[PDB]
Amino acid sequence: VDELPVPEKFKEVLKSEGVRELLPVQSLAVKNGLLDGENLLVVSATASGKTLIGELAGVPKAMQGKKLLFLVPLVALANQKYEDFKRRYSKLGLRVAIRVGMSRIKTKDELVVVDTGIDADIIVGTYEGIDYLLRAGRKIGNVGTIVIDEIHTLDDEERGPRLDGLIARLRKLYPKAQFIGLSATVGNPDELAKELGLKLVLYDERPVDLERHIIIVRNESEKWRHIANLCRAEAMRKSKQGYKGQSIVFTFSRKRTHELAAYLTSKGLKAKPYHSGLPYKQRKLTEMEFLAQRLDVVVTTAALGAGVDFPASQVIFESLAMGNKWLSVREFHQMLGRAGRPLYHEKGKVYLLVEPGRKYSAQMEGTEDEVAFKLLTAPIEPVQVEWSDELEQDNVLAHSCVFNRLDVIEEVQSMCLGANQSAEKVLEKLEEFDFVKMKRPIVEVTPYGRAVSMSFLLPKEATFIRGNLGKREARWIAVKLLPFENIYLSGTLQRELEGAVRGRLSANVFSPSFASILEELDKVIPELSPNAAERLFTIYQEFFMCPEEDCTEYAMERVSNLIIELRRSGKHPTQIAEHFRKVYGLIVYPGDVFTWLDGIVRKLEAIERIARVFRVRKTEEGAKILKREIEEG
Template structure:
């Protein structure tokens, strides 16, 4: 500091053991820092020693120099953390020179670091029994974060945002330890929304009398999304793409069209879903609702026999099938009869990296079948259903279907985030399940929970650690066990089910709460569509007043070495993400596989089948490869090609099997090599 006169804006004094810290500031910048000792004189306390603090040493100055600086200061401030005795001593000393000082609320941590940081009610952050400034609170939070593991920038930003909102550092630190203060864990709330749609009375519908009677016995008016579909030509045979949130009544749209057309002699209904568990449930629902009016059957995978021993009947009036089950029937030349209505549920699966191209190809092949091989009067009506589509208009245009978009959410959904490691998550899940089940809605239902995790083993592990009745639910369970779990949940005998992806596509568990134990599906992070689909299971209008969703996030966690992002990064991407456009993804092998399937089903029409698909396929190149591989001869599949497409094999997998068979390799070794090949891909 220059000994020449220097303007001082603020002179700040703060008591330290045995002396006082002195900070001089101007325009927000520190001019110097120093220490001051006082001595008692006959005139009262006076400066005894004044030392300017350098980077490595202290420079003694005359005590009178402090008085000179104090007289030049525009304002003098004393920290409130200074003791009452110390403040009195400073004020008496300054008063001896006709100088006034004001006590101000400051950050003690800053003061101890020679910084003047006044704080107000709006900027103070509580830390223990004192208040500190925001900058120090952030530094303390960062220190806690370093102890808890690496956090992404998005997670740190969210925690800082919460810190400033609540103004309490200890509560944020508790959040890092998995505490469940709802005021802190709550990320946002998706409000219940309603659209002003005039509901169509059931008595106004022109349905077959038998179906009309069933509906009139169930309700007086259609739900809004159903009313929109009817007003836009559903019962006149119009193809429709219906996009609406979970539990808004989309399935009945497909049922109205399909069952009515069948009863009026316009062909059978084909109802397609992505998962076996969902197919089983839909088949049971249709049997219960319409079994006295129509024959109902199911087709899943390549098998003709369902898990409970009932055979697939291709002549049935209502066929419920998985995508692959019906595609297999087409590839093997099965006669499905006259199809009057095709309902494709969860059509957003078109964008799935593994299965999207197959659904795309199935739609094209099924349209070819209905146009060229089906017998009977009337054109086939196509109904596509989804809760999660970003590009509704564009997708409707490609599918040649009228978009019916209804954005109502029947109940509000709270979305919460808390942090915990993998070992700690079951404890938190147990607390959440107990709290939810102990709550009863205004409709008289206990709150029930779906916990999503990323492996079957983890399903059992979590279920064992829950205090209240629960059950694992995944594709590894036999049919009878899955149905038992579904019945017990529906009867409110279970507080929770713990599942993998089996429920995400819509198995009808009336849950009020969804917990994400993991944000991965297997070794892949969830997409925004998958996440929205899963959280949409929380809250049903006939059961609950609201839904709750909890993301249990492990900082810096990955579930496979190939994952480039961490779980906390993914969490905030999903929470803030916009719905992605539905587009089909193709690599060279996928293009070859779909072209082979189109040749098998369509023969010389294969190019037309390729051209009508959502994804773009270079047909000439694909055909050239199929000839090179020996999969086709002209536009007919060879026996090898037919075997490859019947079993949904990729070319490299087909050649691996073929090479091993020719050399007499043990079947178990063939399976092991295929697993390795899949892992490498």
């Protein structure tokens, strides 16, 4: 530490936090010129404390006022990091604040987005919540260092392209700044690091080299018996001190986390589930409970993004799918990245359970065995960034909302790596719609284009709202744009229908495995228990008594409107999902419900912006009224 050219009050704040020497990833990053101001790219597996690297580049600069910016994909990742860094460093004189696409709904189980001030010298934020501000043309100013954690989210083909465009814009904004790209391990560090102008820091080693074991089962029930036995046995382990052992299970769906968790509770094990769609109250309650040697088994999916600080002595994979898609090698590896490091004492253990020839669906490509060999012996895939036409268009429109001049826009577009086309192309394309207008060689960002880009909306969505202004209510519009999708079947009903159709059934309600049942009332119906058939027909009534032969969108919208009518009456997501279970036996998630109402309010703010642009006052005052009626209930 003392041999590092950084301020000494900084060093004392650090060493009052328990730090002695550089981790190998960070010794390497340092000796790659970190402290001189070089732009660097660290690729090292998670659970190697990648996060820290960012601070190393920006705090000294921010110590003289050269503000530091940190960006993360997730939200609770943003909160965990924001709280950490404020609490560590405001003891120096550094105003620390966080910016997101701020929360809008108001209930008792969620987070208020405090401290969104720009003149604060330390600035944390999400990706969309910041791209929203730059698409509004707002400047930050004194930012000397720019850091991007968990950046490999670029390969993900939804957030990746907006991230590429945002990064090209930010390279245009603050070029003197020291750029740091943090990532878990990925497949193509050499060439990709070349495509950015960043000195590469590879760290493929596992900070904790795991010990890997397998089991085989001939069916699911022996599989779960072995799971119970493995978790009981790992629960009997000790360090030199009086100890126990704690275990994690990566299953494939959330309903499965619940099933497995209550099963192992029935085997006396202290076991519980964990995923997003859970009320934040008991979710972080259970994070805390497992931390303190209270729980034994945690049943989850790969929905364990970063920010979830979770130590286990042993990991178990009941399955290798997420939905009906086999895991990726990087996904599986990051699932192991919560094995090994999490065991404080022993070198972590891994157990995967395999049914031979088992395809948990029919569209999977390879049976569980083939996928198992795939995941274990492959290296990690290369990140894939391909800009679909409209992602390219929206990134171009964001360029316009930030920058005004066609030379600047063309430069930033050439700096894009998913760039398949130019900027003048897309700029004439939007001049057609009057989102921007071309007075060569300058591009004027019209208020229409400004609002639509600020709302992160697709061109198709923008033109749909443009067409159906006034002719439709605000509720109808924002529901058509974003209906609800994450509702599933009660276990009783799903298994009665797996056994009643002689074919494989999807757990969700919007699957063709469900429509086949629906078109066969007089045939599938006369096979059930009284209660099961009762709820089935009640559901067919409320959502599929459809004047059209296809009933999918009718079901989706009826669900969304029911959710709305519950929220305005004064109800909480808890009471909403609880009622759904009570009346129909339908699985709906309060985390999902709150997130979807929040997104619906965002869409209502967008429609409000559009109606406000054109003097459309019906939808303006209706969207204001409904926005508040849903925010406060």
